Amino acid sequence: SNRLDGKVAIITGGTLGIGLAIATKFVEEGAKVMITGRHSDVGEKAAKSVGTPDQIQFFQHDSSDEDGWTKLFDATEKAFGPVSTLVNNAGIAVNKSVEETETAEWRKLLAVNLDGVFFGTRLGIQRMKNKGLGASIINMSSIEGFVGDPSLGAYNASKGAVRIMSKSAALDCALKDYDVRVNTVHPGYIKTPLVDDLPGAEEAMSQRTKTPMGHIGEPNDIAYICVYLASNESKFATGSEFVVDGGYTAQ
Amino acid sequence: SNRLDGKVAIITGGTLGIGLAIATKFVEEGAKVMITGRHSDVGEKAAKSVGTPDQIQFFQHDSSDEDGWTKLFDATEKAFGPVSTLVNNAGIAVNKSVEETETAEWRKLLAVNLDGVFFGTRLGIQRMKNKGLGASIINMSSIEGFVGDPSLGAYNASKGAVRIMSKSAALDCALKDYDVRVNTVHPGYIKTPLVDDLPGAEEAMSQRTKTPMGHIGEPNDIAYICVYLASNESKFATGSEFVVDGGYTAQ
Amino acid sequence: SNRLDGKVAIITGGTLGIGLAIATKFVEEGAKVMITGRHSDVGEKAAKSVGTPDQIQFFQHDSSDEDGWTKLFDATEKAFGPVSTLVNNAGIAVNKSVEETETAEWRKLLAVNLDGVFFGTRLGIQRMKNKGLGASIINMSSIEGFVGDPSLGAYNASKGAVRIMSKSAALDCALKDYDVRVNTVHPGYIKTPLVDDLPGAEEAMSQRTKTPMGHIGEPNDIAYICVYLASNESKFATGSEFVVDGGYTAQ
Amino acid sequence: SNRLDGKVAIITGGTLGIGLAIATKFVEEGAKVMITGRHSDVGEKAAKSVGTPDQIQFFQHDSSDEDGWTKLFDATEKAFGPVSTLVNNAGIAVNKSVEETETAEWRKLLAVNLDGVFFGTRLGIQRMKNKGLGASIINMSSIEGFVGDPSLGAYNASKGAVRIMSKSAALDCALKDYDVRVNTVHPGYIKTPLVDDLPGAEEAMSQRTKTPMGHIGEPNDIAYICVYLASNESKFATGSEFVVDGGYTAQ
Ligand SMILES: [Mg+2]
Ligand SMILES: [Mg+2]
Ligand SMILES: [Mg+2]
Ligand SMILES: [Mg+2]
Ligand SMILES: [Mg+2]
Ligand SMILES: [Mg+2]
Ligand SMILES: [Mg+2]
Ligand SMILES: [Mg+2]
Ligand SMILES: [Mg+2]
Ligand SMILES: [Mg+2]
Ligand SMILES: [Mg+2]
Ligand SMILES: [Mg+2]
Ligand SMILES: [Mg+2]
Ligand SMILES: [Mg+2]
Ligand SMILES: [Mg+2]
Ligand SMILES: [Mg+2]
Ligand SMILES: [Mg+2]
Ligand SMILES: [Mg+2]
């Protein structure tokens, strides 16, 4: 298929669930991939499960670690050549209302979900601009970038922030002829091993008052829209939100 | 690539510009295609330019013609088997403010841009539901479904209508387990022979205060997002808006 | 408090429910009001219930009646002097999915909810512009202009149309220095005698999965935002959507 | 006209510009007001300029100061009785693209524009809920919470965050019957002494390609929508965005 011929992608939080599915489809479409995660044990296994080191490698990194971003770009370029594609996918959740959010929980979530995406987007523009790469930055949001959830206060703040920051970056890149696109992807509920580990979670998410399709998605649902956005097929798409949510936000 | 293996698509206004590009990429991805247009001379030439009759045929139809919709579905099924995919792409423009719109202009534009999309969406749900086809209805909007243009009053009304009607149809199909998805596609400015025929049009559309990328798109920009939405790759996307606009709506 | 000192307002469907509450608060704030409605028994009683003929009168009109719009503006100007304020409030509903909508039902709903708002907006701009009136056109959309409802297909189309058409009109009026603002108001569910006539309707609308406040609104909820938008307090608001919905669209 | 009879309001950054106009109209409508600001010379003068200490007082506070928020609520309750109304208005700007944003600039802007609004919203819910006050939290976003600006990266992030976090808070308050509403106000460009201090700023903002009305707003434009949202007139409005922008976001 070779829809990502010659592309070199960094995928943060690429060792599990949505990130791992994006990495898998990226390799299948001819991209070279560097996945990140916090745990070397999980990360090296994940890279090997997808392909050989000529196709995909692992780099241990917390996306909240500003200095580590420089080392991640350097390692990816050393392995595969200049980075063309960044998927800011690393994220954490706090299951608290705004009212019940402790300040430490607030700061920890924003460090990964907002500062991390800022650090990646900023360095991505700096390193990928003006190189004829057809560069693409895909900032992972969720439906929680569009609608509130009473028990995801900090999460909602982080997703709203990434949603509009990404538009700012898309515009600056476009106006400066940088050859860098910036778009957001907004998954609804997605079935992962982590969802499977919480009894009744998928059933609650599958109720029609949540997901009109009456079931939740799979990681490949998000992988396929990321292939489109990483590919030159989407060369006129910038500053846009792409929602894949089983109808969640349509009602 | 075969991303539309076994799909049978109707594309209204499929003889020119965006519609013809959608038809071309659909055939390339393994879909059987029936294109419509008002002029048999243009339509038969267009079908032949894309492929052989085993791949693509033409059906003369005004999308405002309610009775003709039944005949179009019948002709497509006779040629290719049950229809899986409908692209409601036929549309016209009136270059008038709301203030300066004559009632006849208002009714003529709504007949094609709103009634036509209603007729196609309604019949599409009726004929494609409950057949395991992975059915997909793609309602063509534009940026004028999101933002006003002071000199496109009727056009804006039609695009806002299709945008939210499509969400209603997506939800009903999802809740009733119909196996029909409904999504909207929102092109920004797209270079076509019709744009080329108006001196200075592309230059005005390419100003940064209109399109931040400083150029307009090409028909294939819309073809590629339509391949995604017609394909089973987008099986969790329903009731969603997909914008491909060079940053127009991001500012 | 005289917040509409000197204003002259037409309110379509002003004899019942939301329209009647807008008329009531408009008179209380010093506006002269012409209310319209289909039935003279109801209309004359409604006008007399709010105030004396020097304050408020009734004009029998169906908002789908284009010719009647000219007679309505002429009658209002004869009674009260030049019209400054138009509330396009008249609307009807069809309780059908897009799939199950008959063409006659489609056409009848669009004649009131879309053509009627177009006729009023177009004539309002022509008659109210360039007169130093601080003119304001308030187009009644709905939460159904933002999100789909599987059983309100034609209604969704009409409300999406009014939402975006109003932006077109707002921009043209602003760019041409017409001294006419155009904004949309988007009620959630509002208790009226008509809702009271539908057994279980208020209860369904009050479910937390629909209205997070766990109850529906009252006509004065919409009257108060209309006073703001008709008043010179909102002289910098144009092309905007004002949602009063108990949280319906926030989730 | 006493539209805020009995209300007790905290307005952050209430000593200048928009915040000062909100404080002025709040006192005129019968609210008791505590304004905050960083500087005592400016703050005490601002309070005295609006009214007597029985009507309005000053409290020195940086909205990024978490501990100060407790002292601010305690001081306001000591002066005026229980707080009913919070306007999170304090904000700062960084004139940088995402690419050119230094990490220190990023952190300083988020401390005021995001952490400060979080601290105020969280404490406001805890202190104002379940007291029959008709409590209202008004979070000052911006047009920059809807659309990107290529040279306001960190600002865009902060305003997108406040936009969606406010929906989370609105839903939790509504679902738990807290008698607290949370809404966002989104000013376009507003003339203040600070804008006056930036040569050519108002002129750039007044270009029709930015503000279709061809001029910018004034602080009272934002004061009037805040009176509506603080008042019991808006008792059915929660989780909503209120835009007053001269048409900026309509195109
Ligand atoms: Mg997992
Ligand atoms: Mg790991
Ligand atoms: Mg760096
Ligand atoms: Mg580019
Ligand atoms: Mg053409
Ligand atoms: Mg033709
Ligand atoms: Mg039929
Ligand atoms: Mg389906
Ligand atoms: Mg009547
Ligand atoms: Mg039928
Ligand atoms: Mg005006
Ligand atoms: Mg409640
Ligand atoms: Mg919703
Ligand atoms: Mg101060
Ligand atoms: Mg730097
Ligand atoms: Mg309240
Ligand atoms: Mg103007
Ligand atoms: Mg815009």
From TrEMBL, chains A, B, C, D:
Gene3D superfamilies, alphabetically?
NAD(P)-binding Rossmann-like Domain
Q: Which residues bind NADP(+) 3?
A: T15, R38, H39, D62, S63
Q: Which GO terms describe its molecular function?
A: metal ion binding; nucleotide binding; oxidoreductase activity
Positions contributing to Mn(2+) binding: Q251
Which of this chain's residues are annotated to bind NADP(+) 2? T15, L16, I18, R38, H39, D62, S63, N89, K159, I190, T192
User: Which Pfam families does the entry link to?
Assistant: adh_short_C2 (PF13561)
Q: Where does Mg(2+) 4 bind?
A: Q251
**Has keyword Oxidoreductase?**
yes
Q: Where does Mg(2+) 2 bind?
A: T209
The residues the record assigns to binding Mg(2+) 3 are: T249
The record's family statement is: Belongs to the short-chain dehydrogenases/reductases (SDR) family.
State the PANTHER family in the record.
Answer: DIHYDROANTICAPSIN 7-DEHYDROGENASE (PTHR43477:SF1)
Listed name of the protein: R-specific alcohol dehydrogenase
- Which species is listed as the source? Levilactobacillus brevis (Lactobacillus brevis)
